[PDB]
Amino acid sequence: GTDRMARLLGELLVSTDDSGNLAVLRTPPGAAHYLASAIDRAALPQVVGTIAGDDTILVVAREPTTGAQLAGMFENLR
Amino acid sequence: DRMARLLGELLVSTDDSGNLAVLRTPPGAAHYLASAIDRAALPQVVGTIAGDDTILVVAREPTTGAQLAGMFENLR
Amino acid sequence: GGTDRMARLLGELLVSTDDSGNLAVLRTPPGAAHYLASAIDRAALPQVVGTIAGDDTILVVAREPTTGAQLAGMFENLR
Amino acid sequence: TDRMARLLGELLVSTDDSGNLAVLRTPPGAAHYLASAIDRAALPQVVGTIAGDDTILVVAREPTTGAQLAGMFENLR
Amino acid sequence: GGTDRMARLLGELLVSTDDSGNLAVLRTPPGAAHYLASAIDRAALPQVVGTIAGDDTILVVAREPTTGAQLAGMFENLR
Amino acid sequence: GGTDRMARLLGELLVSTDDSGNLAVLRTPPGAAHYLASAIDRAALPQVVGTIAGDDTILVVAREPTTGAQLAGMFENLR
Numbered sequence: 001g002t003d004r005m006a007r008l009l010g011e012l013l014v015s016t017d018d019s020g021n022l023a024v025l026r027t028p029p030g031a032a033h034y035l036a037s038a039i040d041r042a043a044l045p046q047v048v049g050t051i052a053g054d055d056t057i058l059v060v061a062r063e064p065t066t067g068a069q070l071a072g073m074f075e076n077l078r
Numbered sequence: 079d080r081m082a083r084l085l086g087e088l089l090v091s092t093d094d095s096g097n098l099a100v101l102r103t104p105p106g107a108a109h110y111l112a113s114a115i116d117r118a119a120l121p122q123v124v125g126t127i128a129g130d131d132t133i134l135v136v137a138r139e140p141t142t143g144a145q146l147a148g149m150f151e152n153l154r
Numbered sequence: 155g156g157t158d159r160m161a162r163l164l165g166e167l168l169v170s171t172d173d174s175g176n177l178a179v180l181r182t183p184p185g186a187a188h189y190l191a192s193a194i195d196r197a198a199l200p201q202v203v204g205t206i207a208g209d210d211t212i213l214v215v216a217r218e219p220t221t222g223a224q225l226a227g228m229f230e231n232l233r
Numbered sequence: 234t235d236r237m238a239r240l241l242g243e244l245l246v247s248t249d250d251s252g253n254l255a256v257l258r259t260p261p262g263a264a265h266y267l268a269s270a271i272d273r274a275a276l277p278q279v280v281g282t283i284a285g286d287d288t289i290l291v292v293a294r295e296p297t298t299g300a301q302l303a304g305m306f307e308n309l310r
Numbered sequence: 311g312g313t314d315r316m317a318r319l320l321g322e323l324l325v326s327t328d329d330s331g332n333l334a335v336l337r338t339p340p341g342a343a344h345y346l347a348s349a350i351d352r353a354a355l356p357q358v359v360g361t362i363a364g365d366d367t368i369l370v371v372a373r374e375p376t377t378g379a380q381l382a383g384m385f386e387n388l389r
Numbered sequence: 390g391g392t393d394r395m396a397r398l399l400g401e402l403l404v405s406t407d408d409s410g411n412l413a414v415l416r417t418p419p420g421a422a423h424y425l426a427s428a429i430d431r432a433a434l435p436q437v438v439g440t441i442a443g444d445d446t447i448l449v450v451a452r453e454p455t456t457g458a459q460l461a462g463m464f465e466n467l468r
């Protein structure tokens with residue numbers, strides 16, 4: 001769960017950012033679904049869910065955790 | 079096929095954060111359920127985006143994500 | 155010239171705009187959301203944190219203090 | 234799989250074929266959901282599937298043809 | 311106006327064509343494949359069984375007796 | 390280069406291979422098809438006309454006279 005997420009964050013996370021309740025994660029083209037799957041499988045209590053595009057993932061924070069808090073957690077896992 | 083029928087077939091779970099309802103579906107079903115939501119033309123829904131097993135439904139102010147998630151849950 | 159390409163694709167592909175909070179919601183013809191989102195990404199707007207494309211909808215996340223309504227208005231006019 | 238049979242009943246709009254391919258049509262957005270049930274049925278004469286938005290390509294395992302697969306999907310429906 | 315819209319979008323979006331067996335393989339800019347494939351579907355060509363779009367590639371399935379090469383040639387002429 | 394990067398990702402992402410006629414069918418973990426297909430495309434193999442990625446399956450289209458079977462043997466060898 002968390003170990004596979006941690007590994008893929010190091011492999012696939014290009015950058016992180018945030019706005020309100022959202023963490024925005026950027027990946028190489030095509031990698032968003034694969035990294036998002038790993039986040040989903042980790043089932044973090046402070047993550048409501050994720051949605052992946054092609055190179056971008058929106059991670060929705062569970063109140064009171066903020067998007068900036070999740071972005072910094074992800075960032076420091078790279 | 080109508081949202082009101084497909085919610086019972088395709089909704090795994092509902093949750094919320096701020097102005098977003100977060101719906102989960104079985105793998106691969108998100109676009110199909112989200113299409114039904116879009117077609118429902120709900121006054122309180124600004125729009126939806128589907129991934130593979132997750133839909134984000136955007137609430138129209140002042141409706142909250144929790145209010146929307148409650149409705150989706152209740153109509154399952 | 156990311157902005158010029160985005161401008162012209164908005165003209166071709168942007169059906170409507172709407173918003174809520176920190177989100178602009180852009181509608182496009184079926185299947186076009188990824189192509190328009192790519193152009194928005196490439197313009198690299200300071201007021202945009204990122205985009206997710208679905209099939210006929212793009213969610214554009216606004217960079218604070220810009221609101222969704224403010225982003226939506228900008229897209230609506232570049233159209 | 235009877236789970237695949239029910240979703241074909243529900244979501245299969247039409248079938249067609251060319252060569253080693255069966256081409257399945259679904260309502261908009263439904264292709265991945267139906268293809269998932271096909272994959273899970275693990276049919277011996279199916280090598281694999283790819284889903285688009287409203288179309289699935291189903292690859293026939295030699296010597297089975299696309300036509301034979303399309304006929305099989307028509308039947309189950 | 312399906313065939314006419316399809317021709318216009320091929321001019322805009324078709325980067326290259328190629329073939330193998332019963333398939334025409336169409337290449338587009340990143341993200342554009344679903345939108346072009348939609349235009350092809352809606353044209354309802356008698357020599358096309360169906361399309362599947364990825365991100366930057368479309369597979370167009372030729373209806374017998376038309377080969378993938380004869381289909382790709384048709385698209386190439388509209389590039 | 391692109392072939393080296395592709396080979397490394399095959400080791401990580403290729404669950405199985407199979408073939409039919411001109412097609413090689415590669416299976417990946419869920420969600421990984423687009424990323425492995427991107428690496429294959431970037432490698433620009435002369436044997437490969439093109440790829441389409443689904444969610445866990447990639448269809449790799451062989452450039453004639455290479456067959457699907459030969460393509461799959463190739464990917465298997467690089468894993």
Ligand SMILES: NC(=[NH2+])NCCC[C@H](N)C(=O)O
Nearest residue numbers: 053054055056191207340341
């Ligand atoms: N090759 C592409 N599809 N590019 C556009 C990606 C648009 C958006 N950032 C997403 O991940 O959904």
Ligand SMILES: NC(=[NH2+])NCCC[C@H](N)C(=O)O
Nearest residue numbers: 036052129130131132419420
């Ligand atoms: N099989 C997969 N694609 N899994 C990843 C899904 C990631 C995210 N929950 C979404 O639905 O977009």
Ligand SMILES: NC(=[NH2+])NCCC[C@H](N)C(=O)O
Nearest residue numbers: 112128208209210211261262
């Ligand atoms: N043909 C479809 N996939 N329709 C559903 C679209 C659902 C949602 N508005 C999105 O763009 O992701």
Ligand SMILES: NC(=[NH2+])NCCC[C@H](N)C(=O)O
Nearest residue numbers: 109208209262264265285286
């Ligand atoms: N713009 C898109 N992602 N279109 C394809 C729809 C998603 C997926 N292939 C499905 O049938 O559910």
Ligand SMILES: NC(=[NH2+])NCCC[C@H](N)C(=O)O
Nearest residue numbers: 184185285286287288347363
């Ligand atoms: N709304 C759309 N994406 N339509 C285009 C679908 C293109 C192609 N038939 C596929 O299913 O992949």
Ligand SMILES: NC(=[NH2+])NCCC[C@H](N)C(=O)O
Nearest residue numbers: 054188341343344364365423
């Ligand atoms: N990894 C992804 N699902 N990327 C987005 C695919 C783009 C979409 N199939 C289109 O051509 O418009």
Ligand SMILES: NC(=[NH2+])NCCC[C@H](N)C(=O)O
Nearest residue numbers: 029030364365366367441442
């Ligand atoms: N950004 C990406 N998803 N790139 C990979 C594209 C893979 C394959 N050519 C397709 O269109 O499905």
Ligand SMILES: NC(=[NH2+])NCCC[C@H](N)C(=O)O
Nearest residue numbers: 033130420421422423443444
């Ligand atoms: N319903 C969807 N759009 N699913 C996207 C699947 C993930 C992506 N196409 C991949 O190659 O792994």
Ligand SMILES: NC(=[NH2+])NCCC[C@H](N)C(=O)O
Nearest residue numbers: 105106283284443444445446
């Ligand atoms: N979660 C899913 N989308 N599962 C269905 C995958 C269907 C098909 N094998 C594809 O990769 O396109």
